[PDB]
Amino acid sequence: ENAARLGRQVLGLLPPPTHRVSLTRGPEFARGVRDLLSKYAASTRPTVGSLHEALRQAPFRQPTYGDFLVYSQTFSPQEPLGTFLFSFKQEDNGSSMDMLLTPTSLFMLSGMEAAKAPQTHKVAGVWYGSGSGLADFIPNLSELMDTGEFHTLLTPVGPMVQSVHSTFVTKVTSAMKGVGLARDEPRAHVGLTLPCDMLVDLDESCPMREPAGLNVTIYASLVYLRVNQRPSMALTFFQSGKGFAEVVAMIKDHFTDVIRTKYIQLRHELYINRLVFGAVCTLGTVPFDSHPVHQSLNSLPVLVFANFEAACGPWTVFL
Amino acid sequence: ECRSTNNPWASQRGSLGDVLYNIGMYSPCRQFFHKEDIMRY
Amino acid sequence: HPGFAMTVVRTDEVLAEHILYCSRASTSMFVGLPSVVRREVRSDAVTFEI
Amino acid sequence: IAHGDGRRPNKQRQYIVMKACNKHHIGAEIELAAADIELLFAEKETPLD
Amino acid sequence: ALDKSIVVNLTSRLFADELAALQSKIGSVLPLGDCHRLQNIQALGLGCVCSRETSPDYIQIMQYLSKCTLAVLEEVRPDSLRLTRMDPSDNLQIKNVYAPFFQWDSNTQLAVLPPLFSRKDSTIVLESNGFDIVFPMVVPQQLGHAILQQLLVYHIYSKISALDLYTTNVSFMGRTYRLDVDNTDPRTALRVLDDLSMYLCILSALVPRGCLRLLTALVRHDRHPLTEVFEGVVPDEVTRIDLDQLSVPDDITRMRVMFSYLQSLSSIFNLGPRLHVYAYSAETLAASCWYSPR
Amino acid sequence: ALDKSIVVNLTSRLFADELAALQSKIGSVLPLGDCHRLQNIQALGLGCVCSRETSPDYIQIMQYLSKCTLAVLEEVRPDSLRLTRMDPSDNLQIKNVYAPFFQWDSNTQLAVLPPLFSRKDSTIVLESNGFDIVFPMVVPQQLGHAILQQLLVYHIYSKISAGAPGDVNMAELDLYTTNVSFMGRTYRLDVDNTDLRVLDDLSMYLCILSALVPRGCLRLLTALVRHDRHPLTEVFEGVVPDEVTRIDLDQLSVPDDITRMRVMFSYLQSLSSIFNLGPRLHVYAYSAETLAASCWYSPR
């Protein structure tokens, strides 16, 4: 049976042969070239049998993933399967150790106000502790934010694929390089899931013209502040398919409110580490003309995309 | 062999071409004085 | 007149024709079976590669 | 050379040397009008003008 | 295999004027608005973001190009304009025309500028279908920064009147070039200029005291090749800052926060996306380049 | 549509001692200065530009690395080497030898650098063709692009002491600058007790580049007046120092400025790229004791 049936997969799933054409022996050059156009005349016509042989032609589809480790309390016990994933590194405890942060996580790392995010504060309170749920393992929450060093140690990773939740260690396989294939539901990929609290759109206006494409870019940003004279960050996301030179001049128009009150503070004091501002990371290009699908979870309004190729640029400073 | 040298003023141990042509543009006199050019070929 | 004489180097480019000779049976040649790879092919233009 | 008579050679040696091939690259292009491709190979086999 | 493909249908024929303006230009770069096979004529060139009666600028129109994807011409038929776009990883062959003949080489770094030398040079007239097609200009690093270098000079000196040889001529190695500046919309340029007090005022405060002392030792008796820009005259401030004993770990922690903002100048001194020629002929001008979005 | 195995000609054989030193590493990232594979050895490496004779230069070398295609080795053969050509989004494999060692943390940003070390554990002499093979400095970015951080301040105060030897302490300038502190593992550099001078093309600039930075923002503020003029520049008075706003422009007049201004305009973009244009890789799968990782790269 194995040689009988299972061959008929691999007797058919092979790529096509790069067709060989004999130069010399002139009675065999014409036998070659005749069987090219009869192979080419299939790929023109829209009839039924002519179609499916134009489908074995396939590009390179192979992105590689990441086998991580998580202290399973630092893992919120559910995830919406398409989160962003950070990887925080200060010092290795054991040989092969890792810690991960979701976009629901980083709200709980400063103890920030509910005015900057009144949506996920009710959400991400049950998912973790009270900000001290990750202060047990890192006593340097302040000094990275004090010296301006938190914005460099985070390595952007990508979306999830599937994670095995266990008693003490949650095993996470993330996604990189492009299209993250899902596991439980085949033929559909990992839908990257961003909340409606954190993605800030860039396009909205009066009717008053912009070019379309296949390229809208999601930006990973970071904005300092100091609430109660305590060091504290702000996870803020974006979505814009409008080049690099515009959005740094547009993120500054978004976060003008921080900078105005900021130099009211340090008008009469000079701390050189308080002068750097933030950084930008690029995570990948959603096809512009697609839909951010408003999906409701635990409330927690979440946008989800489709066919998300992924990349990672360096953290680029801005004011 | 009747004389040992034309001049040591081009053939000193610290010769004037080694004074000049051991160290962008083209260099014609680089071909004799640079000792590593002798070591090239 | 200064007390020294002096030597001068001068380079010179010349484009020159040449004569190449070969002898018998020095190389053994072969024949490959080439492939045909289409690229960038529209209803207008059908371009190949060998 | 054959031996003897005041003639002392440096008798038979055998080189055995493995030599290397040398690859070369030839690239060429062919264009075809797609109209003339279709008429030569039609689903119907009536003759042509 | 994939077939990226753009062909522009037309409703009224090319004229004898715009034939030779376009038959001569068989290879260049022009943008698009929408990615299809077909396209109306009112979306091809630079003429969407710029027009004759609308006062153009030299910033946002260039800044508009980062949104688009940009295409390469193939043919000029009397009906149709045949093009192809740029696949994010694919090689092509492009051969420039441009009447400011500049010399490329193999292994270069090219970008695309909007036309800053002369507009009537670039703005071709389209008597058939009205909508002009303004051509963007394919340009290397050494020119592409130097006119952006030239711009941020001049629009400061546009107010210093309220002259011409000092403030517009592109100091290229060999030639100078007057730009086309009479009636612009310099308010987006006014942003970028006021975006420099965001940096150049603020970079000045954390300048370390150590490297400033080298300037006092420099101009007196230790004159270096390019540094005769000072012309043997100090700035007034150079003796007014060096009062500190040169404490090292102060200046260590000063140069870290300085080192951040040097990468921030990329976000304000951007060009368009980037071209990677590896093989190139000078007598032919044809290249071989893969697409890198920037 | 793939062939990445490039055999590059020597003209003779290697030495005898350089068997195992070239068996000490089997995979590294070398440059490839030729689109074709029918190639000499006198064009692949940094010896097309950087060698003994040329002046010690940084920016053209910084221009060169992203200009030049890379390649990854697989095996050392006595006739020739084996280069696998760099495409965008390319898989490769690293088995390192770098002196000093730099720890390869996975999933960070992993750059390519110009070297500055002692050139005895940094190159291998081939007198078979007159070609010192130059491995590029391959250090992760937070170490790598900030390797210049401690060095630069350590470099500038040696110049003032070269004209006035009563200014700078030596053993105090060492300690904070000789040891790069990241991950908690301290790393010591190579000190160069011969007489650094490669960095003349940065530090001699950066002192001239610190001249008119608090001079350019005098007239820039009061120039282009609207009420549409930017709001944060009123807020940004709280940064600029007190002596900066006390400069008289009696010293330098308006048509005299044009040469002195444009130089300060010139180095505020030419410097901005050479810390950004460090082409760069990432590790997805890493091995520690084996030092045989599987990773990926895109030149940028």
TrEMBL record, chain A:
**Which top-rank group of organisms is this from?**
Viruses
Q: Which UniProt keywords apply?
A: Capsid protein, Host nucleus, Virion
Q: In the record, what terms sit under GO molecular function?
A: DNA binding
Q: Which Pfam families match?
A: Herpes_VP19C
Q: Does the keyword Lipid biosynthesis apply?
A: no
CC per GO annotation: viral capsid
Tell me, which GO biological process terms does this entry list? viral capsid assembly
Q: What is this protein called?
A: Core gene UL38 family protein
Q: Which organism is it from?
A: Human herpesvirus 8
From TrEMBL, chain B:
The highest taxon in the source lineage is: Viruses
User: Under what name is this protein listed?
Assistant: ORF25
Gene from which the chain derives = ORF25
Task: Report the portion of the entire protein shown.
Answer: 1230 to 1278 of 1376
UniProtKB/TrEMBL annotation, chain E:
Enumerate the InterPro entries for this protein.
Herpes_capsid_2
Per its UniProt entry, which superkingdom is the organism in? Viruses
Name one molecular function that GO assigns to this entry. structural molecule activity
One Pfam family name from the record?
A: Herpes_V23
Q: Which GO terms describe its cellular component?
A: viral capsid
Keywords per UniProt: Capsid protein, Host nucleus, Virion
Record protein name field: ORF26
Q: Which organism is it from?
A: Human herpesvirus 8 (HHV-8)
Question: What lineage is this protein's organism placed in?
Answer: Viruses, Duplodnaviria, Heunggongvirae, Peploviricota, Herviviricetes
